[PDB]
Amino acid sequence: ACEWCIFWYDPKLCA
Amino acid sequence: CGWHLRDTTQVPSTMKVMILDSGDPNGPLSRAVRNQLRLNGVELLDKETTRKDVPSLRLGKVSIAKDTASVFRNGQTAEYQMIMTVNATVLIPGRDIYPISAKVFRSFFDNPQMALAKDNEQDMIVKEMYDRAAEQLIRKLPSIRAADIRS
Amino acid sequence: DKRRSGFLIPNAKYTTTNYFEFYLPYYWNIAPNMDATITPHYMHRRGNIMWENEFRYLSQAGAGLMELDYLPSDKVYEDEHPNDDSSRRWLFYWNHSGVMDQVWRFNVDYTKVSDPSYFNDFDNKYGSSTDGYATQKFSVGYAVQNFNATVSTKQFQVFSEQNTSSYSAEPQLDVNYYQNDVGPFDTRIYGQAVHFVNTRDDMPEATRVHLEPTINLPLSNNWGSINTEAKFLATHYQQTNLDWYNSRNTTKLDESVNRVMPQFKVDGKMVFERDMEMLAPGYTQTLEPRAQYLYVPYRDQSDIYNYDSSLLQSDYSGLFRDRTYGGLDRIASANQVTTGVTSRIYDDAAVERFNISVGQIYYFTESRTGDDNITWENDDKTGSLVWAGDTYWRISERWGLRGGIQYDTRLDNVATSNSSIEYRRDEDRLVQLNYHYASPEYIQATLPKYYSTAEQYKNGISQVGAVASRPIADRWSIVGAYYYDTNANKQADSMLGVQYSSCCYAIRVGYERKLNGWDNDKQHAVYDNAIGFNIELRGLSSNYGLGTQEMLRSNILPYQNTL
Ligand SMILES: CCCCCCCCCCCCO[C@@H]1O[C@H](CO)[C@@H](O[C@H]2O[C@H](CO)[C@@H](O)[C@H](O)[C@H]2O)[C@H](O)[C@H]1O
Ligand SMILES: CCCCCCCCCCCCO[C@@H]1O[C@H](CO)[C@@H](O[C@H]2O[C@H](CO)[C@@H](O)[C@H](O)[C@H]2O)[C@H](O)[C@H]1O
Ligand SMILES: *CCS(=O)(=O)N1CN(S(=O)(=O)CC*)CN(S(=O)(=O)CC*)C1
């Protein structure tokens, strides 16, 4: 539920 | 980075043909809503047409308020806040009636020395809020479609 | 209906302005569509009864309210103005609104007072001590689906005795025509004829005629949109009574002026979507880039007096607006591109939970109206000059926060900003915090010079407000508000309200301390205290509320719902 993912998210960071 | 172009229309496919109904069909809100629906490729019908299974969009009360948001050291108004509230409803004929709303916030500074000018500014702001209140309502159409499928 | 007409319950209040005040209302049911009220309002300090007459009506043309307050004499005003022959104080108010046959639109918003200090002395029912002027508008319009023509007159009674000169449109005619399927284009024509008159006899009078045809090409996709627009502006000015201004100003006003200008606008928008599974299952994010190129040639408008053009505030929505000024006396030249971006969040139910926007305006050339009297803090003319940001977060069902910020590099400081966080369980249970800011540089740039030199204006705005409302035992309702200016470290407005509601009656007690004026003899602010007591009879109607929203709007900075 990390809300700060809005301004930074990248699919391969997850996996 | 995960982004893709929107592959779905802003207006849901079942709402591509609909009836726009209001008690003030020639008013400014109705004009704004009709223009926004025309921009999205929506076919608007008259309320007397015989086509059925056509969702209806009934616009309701519109309230515009002008209040004092801040004051100077002498107690005179510095900033006016204008509030637009629009209540509408969507009737899906077989299913159900879903109500939606829109609230628009704008502000502008006062100037007693240029009161006439300020009045025109106010008018322009109102003309904008209607448009801002229209896109808001169309933006809630996909939410209605999702609620329709859920029930 | 003599059965339904009679005396209401008297209410009272103690004020610092008028000491003990006493109202004795009398309701009168003339008809099922027309009702009236007569209220003797005795003020002790002025030692006299002022008569309030209120009249509501519903007709075919719409619904309206008339109000007339008359005070034959006033001891306080007589003391403050010995030279005046009479100390009578009156107010006339008329508000009518209606649409008849769906085509005729009738609007009246008229206020007139006997003296500028009326609202600082008497209670604020159809006005306020916060207003700097009184407005008098009449408008009759005819509007069908593709046409509308409105004739209106606007007048203003300015209160502050710095410069009581004010321009009026007597009358103003507005005509709009629309076409939508002429080929692939959309077309509209806007016409206007106006006549500006002034209160003083030495200021210019004008007649303006304006024509404006626009043609636009919209193109749309599921993910993108681009709208091109070509607009034409043709204005004709006939100005008279120019001897005074020309004899005192170095730039000369011209009798006959013609102003012809093209305008080209290109607007484009894209929508990107992505899946945000880390927030919660089903949530999605949307990115919305928007760009707009605006080009308006430069015409020197120094020979036209500025009658009704004022600087427009540039929030995020106003970044993409194609005008710098309101009205039509100042059309700024433009060679600019506006770039902005909006991010939105939806849940599994496709409901917007959060949105944030940021944008800027890049000027390729300086915007000129021929005359430029705006006092900037630096000589920046081109580049990224204006920035605006907006945000709205619906944290939960009972929480919500809003924010907006404006930055101007020519001010070398944030121009204006505002924020508000509100908890609202229900119309009786709520808490709200809000903040308003306006830099002194912004006041200097966008307001007259004596605002920059006057103590009560020059420091800008830095205001923090708190509003709270809490019921007890379903019968009581406590309401409070407090507004504090951090620049002066002084109270601006505070309110307290307690209402006891029962089956047959409701008793309201309210206190308020507000900024009421400015005393320039030793240069401080003047406050006013008011403690009121009011009883109203229940049961006759369907209203059973605790009255919280009524007391929340009773102060000079009324509460507004922001979710
Ligand atoms: C002040 C400047 C701007 C500040 C910027 C802050 C940006 C924050 C963006 C928040 C976006 C939406 O935030 C999202 O809210 C929802 C709704 O409660 C939370 O979701 C939560 O409640 C929902 C609804 O009951 C549950 O289904 C979910 O399991 C739970 O986590 C998400 O965990 C959070 O990610
Ligand atoms: C990018 C998207 C933005 C989303 C919306 C963000 C909303 C932000 C709301 C900001 C609320 C606080 O508002 C902020 O108040 C402070 C404190 O007075 C002002 O800051 C001020 O501080 C002191 C004076 O007090 C000066 O030294 C400074 O130069 C001046 O700016 C800010 O200019 C204003 O922005
Ligand atoms: C803000 C989300 S992130 O920076 O891209 N991030 C990547 N992952 S993930 O959120 O699990 C992507 C599915 C790991 N983290 S996190 O700790 O899980 C963020 C709450 C960072």
Numbering used by the authors:
A (entry chain C): 1 to 15
B (entry chain B): 999 to 1149
C (entry chain A): 222 to 784
Quote the passages of the study that discuss this structure, keeping the authors' original sentences.
LPS biogenesis systems are essential in most Gram-negative bacteria, with LptDE responsible for the delivery of LPS to the outer leaflet of the OM. The outer-membrane associated β-barrel is made up of 26 antiparallel β-strands (β1−β26). These β-strands are connected by turns on the periplasmic side and extended loops on the extracellular face that fold over the lumen of the barrel and require rearrangement to allow LPS molecules to reach the external surface. LptE is tightly bound in the LptD β-barrel.
